[PDB]
Design an enzyme around this catalytic site. Structure first.
Site, short mmCIF file in Angstrom:
data_model
loop_
_atom_site.label_atom_id
_atom_site.label_comp_id
_atom_site.label_asym_id
_atom_site.label_seq_id
_atom_site.Cartn_x
_atom_site.Cartn_y
_atom_site.Cartn_z
N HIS A 111 -1.70 -5.53 1.58
CA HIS A 111 -2.90 -6.32 1.35
C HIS A 111 -2.51 -7.70 0.83
CE1 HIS A 111 -6.69 -7.65 -0.52
NE2 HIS A 111 -5.90 -8.10 -1.47
N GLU A 131 -8.41 -11.05 -7.79
CA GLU A 131 -7.49 -9.93 -7.62
C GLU A 131 -6.33 -10.01 -8.60
OE1 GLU A 131 -6.56 -9.97 -3.45
OE2 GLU A 131 -8.60 -9.30 -2.91
N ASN A 155 -1.76 -0.09 7.39
CA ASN A 155 -1.25 -1.40 7.74
C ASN A 155 -0.45 -2.06 6.62
OD1 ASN A 155 -3.31 -2.26 6.12
ND2 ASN A 155 -4.35 -3.49 7.67
N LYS A 178 0.84 -1.20 0.00
CA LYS A 178 0.00 0.00 0.00
C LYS A 178 0.88 1.25 0.00
CE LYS A 178 -3.70 -2.42 2.44
NZ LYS A 178 -4.58 -2.46 3.64
#
Lengths: 149, 149, 149
Positions: free
Chosen positions: B115, B126, B112, B10
């Site tokens: 993913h 995905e 966090n 991320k």
């Protein structure tokens, strides 16, 4: 909402020369160093630090082990009091979870490398004992937007 | 049988400059890099990525946090979908086990770092969303005899 | 009161070239290297090492996987037999805790990098199997006062 906790590298951390590795574990989570001071702990200050244990048979030997160089530290972060305790692991290294400081570095509770405040009340008390307010520094981490929600 | 999972660093992972450390954790288990691409995630692709959250009050803020540079990755290994989730740790870094990515690097669920697909079906979807088939590379690790039974 | 455990880096540890990383994990806790030897394990010694599995269908394949270079080691420390097992993690890497050797390095039980004695009796037997008494080295760690209570 961040908080502050008192963390102290004990003489075994100094003598085993793992100070930088310890600090790196806390920096890695984006915790901010709000205070840091090297001193030599003395019996009079250790008696206050361990006031809850006054009179217990183990205290004299504990004070002897702790009479030596220590690194006093204040770290700031979300839930940092409880989180620092989790990162240190159980007081007895044999019981501490893999990946914690005590499990990764230590064998016995009497030489368990580091102390951290166990509560907000003890953090306030310990920070006041070991630091002057002048020594707590206020600044903002530049990566804050990527550390905090 | 090996499988493939979708893992995405991320924007906080990019900006905190821990990409290499993240990749190293997966390489260390002998997981194979099958695909890797730096892009900038946009609201339209993130709406599809987060399709399960359509209509939920938190989705707009989630899409804002994720609008930024990301590293799209596919790793291959035995049980890698579940194992990568175990390595990432709980959504909340404060609940994640020591030694996991989120516990070691992060403080809050909204930052966090990474993913990973939560199931076989989400991994397939995905991978197809973020990569064209021609971007998925097939090769054999030279140490395969020492990684796999 | 310290004890000694037998730890063996299996051929996958040698070939993946992680010997030093494995040794560093044990040195990090102040465990003392009491013996160390590189050898090529033979079926005859492996049959005795795995005597508990005599007659089981998986034994021949287990011996075959282990017929290769290995690093025989003895480490000394408080509770080191149980503690080394905890640091290795579950036999199946997918079940091992994050921060353990098997979880951090491996995928499958048949290539799980390292063996450690599982009990006091097994440690004594395995040390005597793989090492002659003259190969066990007695010395004191200079940091002992900072490792042991």
């Amino acid at each position: 909402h961040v908080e502050q906790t008192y963390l102290m590298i004990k003489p075994d951390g100094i003598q085993r020369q793992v100070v930088g590795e310890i600090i790196s574990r806390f920096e890695k989570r984006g915790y901010r160093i709000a205070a840091m001071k090297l001193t030599i702990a003395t019996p009079a200050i250790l008696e206050e630090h361990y006031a809850e244990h006054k009179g217990k048979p183990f205290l004299p030997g504990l004070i002897e082990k702790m009479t030596g160089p220590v690194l006093c530290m204040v770290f700031e972060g979300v839930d940092v009091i409880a989180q620092a305790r989790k990162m240190m692991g159980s007081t007895r290294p044999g019981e501490a979870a893999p990946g914690t400081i005590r499990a990764d570095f230590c064998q016995q509770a009497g030489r368990n490398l580091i102390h951290g405040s166990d509560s907000a009340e003890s953090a306030k008390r310990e920070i006041s004992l070991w630091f002057k307010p002048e020594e707590i520094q206020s600044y903002k981490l530049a990566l804050s937007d990527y550390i905090f929600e």
